[PDB]
Structures are given as structure tokens and as C-alpha cells.
Structure 1
Amino acid sequence: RPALYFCGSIRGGREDRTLYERIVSRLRRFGTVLTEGGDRLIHEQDLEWLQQADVVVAEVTQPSLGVGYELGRAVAFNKRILCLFRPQSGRVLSAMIRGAADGSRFQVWDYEEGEVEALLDRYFE
């Protein structure tokens, strides 16, 4: 069973918090979600988990410095990465996330919110 790291906006805004809870609930079916002192403790503890993770899953619809930073560190750690983006939000996903995808180790999937459990099923089965 893989160790999993979930990323989603917090101080960038909690608009998608209920969706994040759905994603984490589904990820727990497959493995251990590691992400579930001030800000330094948060950074250091999360960097520890990010190196431990087998897969990094990020919901990248809501813009967030912390999510982007986690993804940048994860790429440099050579982590397998799954990013999930909702075009129906009306946003354009950052070129630094869209353009980081190599289609294998770093995947970016566009999706509709109702399908997120099914999409995670497809990725983790």
C-alpha cells in the first residue's frame, strides 16, 4: 500500500475544501495519507512526508503558493505526481503546472468535479 501526499489550497483559499475531503477519503481506500513550531514546523514536517510519499496528488484548481511549492519540491525529489484540474472553474491552469507534465511521472488530468472518485480509481488500479 502506497504512502500518499495530498495538496490543496488552504491560505490561498478554502473554496474547494469539500472536494479535497472527498479526494482524501478516496485516497485512504488505497493507502496512508501522510498529510492528514509555527510555519517552519509545517514546512519541515511536510518536506519530510513529501520525500516519503509514493504518489503526490494535488488538486490544482484554486491558485495557491503552497501547492505550487509542494509540486516544485516534489518534481525535484523525482516523485510520481498526479495533478487534478477543473476547467469548469473558468480558470486557466498555470503554465508551470500544465507544462511540467511529462505524461508519466507527472500527469495533469482535466476533469469534472463529480468524477473525481472514479478518476482516482482509474489512476490507482
Structure 2
Amino acid sequence: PALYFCGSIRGGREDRTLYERIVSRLRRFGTVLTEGGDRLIHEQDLEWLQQADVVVAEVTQPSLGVGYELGRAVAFNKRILCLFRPQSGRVLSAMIRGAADGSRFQVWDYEEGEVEALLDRYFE
């Protein structure tokens, strides 16, 4: 299983420690392809994105990059899991919340402390 991980960087790194947690778990389930010059980045991740079997994304921290990766990932027909925290106070965008279909694209609300648990349940 080849896994692509999306999570905010230039939109804010508020959740970096959580991203690391989320990635540490994914490496128990597969290789993680992720992690003028912005053109290299764009070009490289678009290739990794093409190769993934699951696209896992943390969508609390608003970010253009994460949004665009999801848009290209829907186009490529990839299987997509999004993770959102209602505790944050924000309201997930409707473009994300309503691209969900309940299987190929899923969106799960969670509390930050049980992310490993949830991850175990999805990749089983």
C-alpha cells in the first residue's frame, strides 16, 4: 500500500506534531511517498499523488495546498480519507464535507488523542 499524506504547511504549521503522529502510524501500513522551485514541488508531488493507493489528509488547518491535492486526487479517482477535528471550532468547508460519498472518499470527525485508533480501523 502506497500512501500520500496531505496536511497544511504554508497555510500554517499549527498541527505539525499531529501530522508526524499521523505519518508514524501510516508507516506501519505502507510506504509514504510524501516528505521555479515551487514548480519542482508541484511536479514531484503530482507524481507521488498519481501513485498512491490511499490519499490520507488532515483537513482542520485551512490550506490551499491540501485542498488542491484533494482536487487532483478526486480527478485521479484515488481512494481518499480526510480527518477533521470539530474541537478546533472551525466548520469544514462544504467543498470538502460534500465531496464525501461514504466509501471512495470519506471524512471522519475525531478527537486528536484517538487518531492512531481510527487509523488502525481504516487500514485493516
TM-score category (smaller protein) = over 0.9
Deviation (angstroms), 1:36: 2.1
Q: 1:5-45: per-residue Cα shift (whole Å, max 9, x none)?
A: 00000000000000000000000000000002510000000
SS at match of 2:22: helix
Name structure 1 gaps, 5 residues minimum.
none
| Whole-Å separation in 2 of the counterparts to 1:37 and 1:77 | 25
What is the SS of the residue equivalent to 1:73? helix
In structure 2, C-alpha distance between the alignment counterparts of 1:6 and 1:15, rounded to whole Å = 16
Per-residue CA deviation, residues 53-89 of structure 1 (Å, 9 max, x unaligned), is 0000000000000000000000000000000000000
Are 1:91 and 2:93 matched, yes or no?
no
Q: Distance in 1 between matches of 2:37 and 2:102?
A: 36
The residue that corresponds to 1:51 in the other structure is 50
4+ aligned runs moved over 2 Å, structure 1: none
Determine the structure 2 residue equivalent to 1:28.
Answer: 27
Q: Aligned residues, how many?
A: 124
SS of residue in 1 equivalent to 2:117: helix
Whole-Å separation in 1 of the counterparts to 2:29 and 2:118: 13
Structure 2 runs not aligned, ≥5 long: none
Query: Matches of 2:2 and 2:121 in 1, distance apart?
Result: 18
